[model samples]
Target chain A: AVEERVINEEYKIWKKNTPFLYDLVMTHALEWPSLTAQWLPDVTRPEGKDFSIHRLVLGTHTSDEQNHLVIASVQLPNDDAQFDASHYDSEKGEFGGFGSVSGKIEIEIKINHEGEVNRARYMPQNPCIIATKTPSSDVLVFDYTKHPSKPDPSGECNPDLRLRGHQKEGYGLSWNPNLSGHLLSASDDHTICLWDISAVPKEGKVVDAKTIFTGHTAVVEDVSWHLLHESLFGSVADDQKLMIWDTRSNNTSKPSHSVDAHTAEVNCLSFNPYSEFILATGSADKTVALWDLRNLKLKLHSFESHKDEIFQVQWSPHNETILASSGTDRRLNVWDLSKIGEEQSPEDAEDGPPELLFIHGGHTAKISDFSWNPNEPWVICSVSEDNIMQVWQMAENIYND
Target chain B: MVLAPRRRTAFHPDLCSQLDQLLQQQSGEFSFLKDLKGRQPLRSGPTVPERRKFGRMKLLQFCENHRPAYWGTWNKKTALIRARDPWAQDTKLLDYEVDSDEEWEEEEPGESLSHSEGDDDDDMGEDEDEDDGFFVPHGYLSEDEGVTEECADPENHKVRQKLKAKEWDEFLAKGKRFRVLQPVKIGCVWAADRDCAGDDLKVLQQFAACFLE
Candidate 1:
């Protein structure tokens, strides 16, 4: 019954927006059953520590726009849920608010015993595109905006590296679900590099890049490497193509197969977590597309679920049944990959067509990005242009009394 | 004999292309795409070889409340190239120190190396934390609030050499301004984007690589 409510909403929105979504949103999707609080707390670095949240700002939990901003955190585990620690939370941590439009950062300096030691480090103000921490205390900061020769020593982050050198590709960042120390960053500079952060001390070094894949010409938007196959991984970029490159690039000029079909920027892309072959990419042109690498042809289900640019797209890690895209007109929908043409399943069938579930409302602004918690499937967080930050708690029966 | 009918699990888009490459590079240290030295990559080789009649995609139950997990690879060689030989342009080249007579590292036995206000100004763990600090971030790039005139202080140039500061300066003096330089290797994926196109991907690749070297 509740599934029907979801399906009804999905279809209604599909009808109102892009009616060409091939009804792929319906049908049975491989959905993972989730248990526990959706907003799970993580250990705020320094390992084996407890912390409290000082404050949570960055989005307008408000129903209004223009009041939203970026969110950064500083955590002190030993002290309540104070998120601001003296150190960086993988540099991925950026925040705003506390009563201001701009966000402030946490920095620590060391004074010498002689009172004469002076260490001045200037990490330019170029913010890292993506920063993440491994199980170790090391934070991987990917700053691909500053030029190599010209480090915009703007922020005055004394003893900072922004003034040191080059950091190009800045779109995608990911860590191995299996390997705790390994890090992956994809660049528009036409190379996918790797690093080992397992035995990280204050900072982790690049243990090994393993291989670099040279396939795309334009900027590479995202790169997905197989958790099972270290030698193999896939990448998509502004080149409007998806290419799969294995380590044997010492002899080739391009990826094994470059499928150039996306009309605009290939913004969102992922390899089905459970099933590796199914490639899903969301574009700025307002379409959710699925590709079958075997046939190297676009799947029949080219989901034009929204009316504007589709920025955020993710394959359901639970089951390949559903793929998600949230961007542009700020429409977030989870399609059931089972049925076709919105044909409703029987009343008694265990699986049926996809329901539109819930369109996370409250963000008066268009969405910029949304990060699904790795451990939580139902709890979703999204940031919108309206300065709106929303946390949607999903359950099987939101309609239950 | 007919095979038993079952549900179908759709193949990832590059199901065959990956297999084709796996099949092609069936040599070298990376040939074992199925299972490696304790590391299970995100994918396996040659899915087409396995004939599956019907297999419904079943997502097992998992806690929906977990930090977003990520996975990627590392480039050690590229880093070594940089740490040992920084680019001609890079000014700050990380240099390992040489054994000195007065160089007695102050081992505080065991101390929490967390970044917080500390009583000890002389960081004994400076050498150890120098490389470690690279991975730890301080703040996001704050935008310029226009050029505000501030008194230019000459004292800002002082190098606050703590644990290995003296050795670091000497190490730098050992070479003609040692700097870490990473080659123009390709294929590095990052996680964020600014309002502009992006930073050079090569720098981050080399930046991450320097630690290993």
Candidate 2:
């Protein structure tokens, strides 16, 4: 109990420094902890207004209470007024000297869900179409537009569609960007199921997988579709292997290329949008490896800064060379590929790698999920197991160099 | 204000070599080296097997001993209901007095009514079970039978009980919806240091080789 008080005091100190550390930081408390937090692609700006509305997709994880798939919106300052001069104290060399920004749930819509949502994602082509993975083997798909904004009081509402095939529960769910309604789901059964809902009628309630890739020997943690190639995708598993599958190939069951990418379970992987040949994978070995798709045998570089297992890795949609990784160590590290092997000053030579750009250490508990804001280049929203959702942007000077 | 980049201590090869030499000198009686050298290197890391073993043991211990507060509450409620029910008492008597024909004949109508009532309870409990979203064990006793063996010391047991109650209280408190977001402190950002060269670097490599081989 005494130690907890110490932790609370440490938190207070960090809260005091938030103004100076971040350009814009908004904290929102959730009723239940969310394992996944993703930003909706669209940014709606009211005409002649200083704030813009950004919606987010989040899910609830409750033990006894009803779980929900939540859609909430937040108001962010426009570019012109984003950097407030009044908040900074020039004499003290401080920006936002003390206190933190408390953000409200501007607009919230809740849909009652069965079991806890392991993960939730919105379709790239249509934000209204959302999919969620639960503690069950089935994946539930919903059309947000068709469902009422308020939760069903009966708690007996069913999903619009169910994607079934996995024999075990799963957390990995990704929608293909290039091919609309094409979804890939990885499961604990060591298989990845591909579902094409494009041809399904609006009245369809259940859909079966088109293909089941079974190259992984252990639980597949995450799957990602190639940025440009609609038929190509990647899957990482607890077997420490990164498997690249090409649906165009004759053998849909086998991966085109399988590489032992890490020493421990690979948790997540992200393909570089600008550079199609490049991808990054985070693993349980406390390292993140950048691999070239053309040659999977040898990783381009390995980042060994995090002391705990990495949970998520993502490449910046705006900058090809910039990438971010979050781990159980409560740190979100931003790395610049172009800065690798760069000469460092004698005084700071021991600070890991020059490629490491900035670190966001605002989260106290293990960060479950984080997503980059597609509309705002430097903006990011991250959720932790502590029921905290933070939307922050790094100070301009930190990444400018 | 100038922001200072997080610093990490560089791995000292000289220090590593010194530690290795010290360990080698003390290897004859050192228990750590004895355990380390007992296993052969496999495809997985050297510590993988032992780590997995430890994890399994911990998981088994947790499953055998720990019961969440909600489960405890449910068990208490079920016990109270069962103790007060007359049919439950009759069923227990029937189990012991199987040769009593007169008693069986008198209990037949009551047993049928109990069955019908049980069906209704089951139908209602189905919805309640879904709302609770937890598996309720039927036969498990909530008493501290196995707990005493796990924690032999009475003082330690008392402390654990206090901690468990605190944990349950915290869990219940978290169930409430907070209108405002509470601020949580951020951890300090750091990176690993790797800037050794010359003799020190060579010494570190030799130390690593000793462990690997």
Question: What TM-scores result for chain A when each predicted structure is judged separately against the true chain A?
Answer: 0.56, 0.94
Residue A122, candidate 1: Cα error in Å is 24
Best by TM-score: 2
lDDT of 2 by residue, B43-96 (tens): 111001122221100000011111110100000011211111111222221232
For model 1, what is the error of residue B205's alpha carbon versus the real structure, in angstroms, after optimal superposition?
73
Q: What does candidate 2's lDDT look like per residue over A1-401, in tens digits?
A: 88567555544444433333455566666889888888886777765666677788889999898998888787665665433433434443333223222233443688888888888988887778999998888899887888898899986758988889989877888889778889989899998999898878978889998888888999999998877556778899999899888776778667667789888999999987655467899999988998765566677779877889999998876666788999887778887776666688754545557667766666768888989777766778888888888877764445652
Best by lDDT: 2
Model 1 misplaced stretches (Cα beyond 4 Å): A1-169, A196-212, A248-253, A341-358, A398-401, B1-213
DockQ of each: 0.01, 0.01
Candidate 1 TM-score to native: 0.41
Candidate 1 residue lDDT tens string, A299-392? 5457764678776677554444555677756566665454334555354122222333334433334665564433323435455554334444
